[PDB]
Amino acid sequence: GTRQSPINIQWKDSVYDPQLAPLRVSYDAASCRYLWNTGYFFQVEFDDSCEDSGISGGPLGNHYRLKQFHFHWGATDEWGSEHAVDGHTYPAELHLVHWNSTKYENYKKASVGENGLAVIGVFLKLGAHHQALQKLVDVLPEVRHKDTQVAMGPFDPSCLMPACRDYWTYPGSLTTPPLAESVTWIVQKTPVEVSPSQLSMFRTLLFSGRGEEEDVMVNNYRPLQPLRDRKLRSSFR
Numbered sequence: 001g002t003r004q005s006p007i008n009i010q011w012k013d014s015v016y017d018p019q020l021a022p023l024r025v026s027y028d029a030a031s032c033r034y035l036w037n038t039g040y041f042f043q044v045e046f047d048d049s050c051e052d053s054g055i056s057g058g059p060l061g062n063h064y065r066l067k068q069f070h071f072h073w074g075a076t077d078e079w080g081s082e083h084a085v086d087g088h089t090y091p092a093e094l095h096l097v098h099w100n101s102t103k104y105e106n107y108k109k110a111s112v113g114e115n116g117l118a119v120i121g122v123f124l125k126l127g128a129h130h131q132a133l134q135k136l137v138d139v140l141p142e143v144r145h146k147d148t149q150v151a152m153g154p155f156d157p158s159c160l161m162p163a164c165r166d167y168w169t170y171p172g173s174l175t176t177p178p179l180a181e182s183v184t185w186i187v188q189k190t191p192v193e194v195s196p197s198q199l200s201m202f203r204t205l206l207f208s209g210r211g212e213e214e215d216v217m218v219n220n221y222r223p224l225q226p227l228r229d230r231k232l233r234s235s236f237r
C-alpha cells in the first residue's frame with residue numbers, strides 16, 4: 001500500500017506540529033506476564049485488562065492500552081533497526097505496542113483496524129550497560145527456541161525509554177504480516193544506550209524450534225519503505 005513502515009526519518013521531511021499534546025506514558029509493571037520467542041523476535045507480553053496501563057496524549061485520540069513490546073536487531077552492530085534517521089540505522093530497535101481500547105473490542109481486532117495501534121519506537125545504541133534491560137537479557141537462555149516462553153515478574157517498559165521524549169509521528173503499518181496499515185508511529189529522537197554484551201545475547205536466539213536444525217535469529221527487521229506523501233510531524237523544533 002501507501003502507508004507502510006519502516007521509513008527513513010529525514011529532517012527535510014519533518015514539520016513541527018506545536019498542536020501535539022503532551023505524551024502521557026503510564027505503565028502498570030504488575031501486569032507483566034511472560035517473555036517468549038515468537039519465531040521472528042522475542043516479545044514481552046502484558047495483561048491488557050488494566051485500563052490505566054498504556055499511553056495517551058501526543059497524536060492519540062484517546063488512551064491506548066499496553067499489550068506487548070519486542071525488539072529488532074541485525075547480524076552485526078552496524079545495522080538492525082527498522083527505522084533509519086537520515087539514513088543512519090542503529091544496532092536495534094524496541095517497539096512498544098498499544099491498542100485502541102475505545103475503538104476496538106480487543107487487540108486482535110485492533111491490530112488490523114483503522115486506528116488499532118500506536119507503537120513507540122526507541123533506537124538502541126552501543127554505550128553503557130543498561131540496568132533495566134539486564135532483567136530481560138538474563139532470561140533469554142530460556143527462550144532460545146521458537147515458541148518457548150518463560151514467566152515474567154513485574155517490569156515497567158518506561159525504564160527502557162530515553163529521558164528526553166521528543167519524537168516524530170506518522171501513519172504506518174505492521175512491519176510483519178499482515179502488514180496492515182493500522183499503526184500510528186511514535187519514534188523517539190533520543191536513542192537508549194546498551195552495552196555490546198547485552199546486544200550479543202539477542203543474537204543467540206533461534207528462528208528454529210527444538211529438534212530442527214539451528215537457524216540463528218538475526219536480521220529480523222523489514223527493509224525501508226517509501227514515505228510517499230505522508231506527513232512526518234515532529235513534537236520538537
Ligand SMILES: CC(=O)Nc1nnc(S(N)(=O)=O)s1
Nearest residue numbers: 095097111119173174175176
Ligand atoms: C499482532 C501484532 O499486532 N503484531 C505486530 N506485528 N508487527 C509489529 S511492529 N513490528 O510493527 O511493532 S506488531
Ligand SMILES: [Zn+2]
Nearest residue numbers: 070072095175
Ligand atoms: Zn516491531
